[PDB]
Amino acid sequence: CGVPAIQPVL
Amino acid sequence: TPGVY
Amino acid sequence: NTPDRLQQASLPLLSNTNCKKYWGTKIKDAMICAGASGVSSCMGDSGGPLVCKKNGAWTLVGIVSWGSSTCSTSTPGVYARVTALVNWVQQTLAAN
């Protein structure tokens, strides 16, 4: 859980 | 003032 | 009128004691505040996540609940505190 395949850019 | 989201 | 595309915002967590300066006795133990930083959750965000990165993984810390009726960005939003509700979540999942 909690590890997106597409990384968020903040 | 307060309010539901 | 909600936006078409998914929005995001980073914001700091506050302590319930400091949050009480804004909301008084309305803040309960099962609540956690965040914001008052120039951004704000608003109508339609309710039920959504407030996630914090712990040990490299995004963890659900809060559920958008309520806040300023005008979504003021200088007032903290109030979220359901997940740590106080997780035991119920696990009992529910185990029995259904």
Binding site: - | - | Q7, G47, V51
Partner: protein, 131 residues
């Protein structure tokens, strides 16, 4: 979200949209596994509402979204509608979500996890950007 920014499509894979039968988005939610979604109890979800997963642009007709039916609504028995305390509801899906690059679960914390004031976190959603 007021003063937020557009997210990278699919970067918040657990984010779901709760829509009524008319297609109106009324609340958000988070997938915690293939069969369960966590949302707010005050959203007043019913089994007639739909969970939409894998969505980024609600105005798009070309996204491969998943419209999931709700089997049961589990409102936390401690929910207090007068104070909006213990504002949580679990939704068991009739049909399991299919996890992919754009659809997956968020982690849940341990009851004793500590998240200090001052920590910078993130919130997402399709809520109003201006009131």
């Amino acid at each position: 979200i007021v003063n937020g920014e557009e997210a990278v499509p699919g970067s918040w894979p657990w984010q779901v949209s709760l829509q009524d039968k008319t297609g109106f988005h009324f609340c958000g939610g988070s997938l915690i596994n293939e069969n369960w979604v966590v949302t707010a109890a005050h959203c007043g979800v019913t089994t007639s509402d739909v969970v939409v997963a894998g969505e980024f642009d609600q105005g798009s007709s070309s996204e491969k979204i998943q419209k999931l039916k709700i089997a049961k609504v589990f409102k936390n028995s401690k929910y207090n509608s007068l104070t909006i305390n213990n504002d949580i509801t679990l939704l068991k899906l009739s049909t399991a979500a299919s996890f992919s690059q754009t659809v997956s679960a968020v982690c849940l914390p341990s009851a004793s996890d500590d998240f200090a004031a001052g920590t910078t976190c993130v919130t997402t959603g399709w809520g109003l950007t201006r009131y």
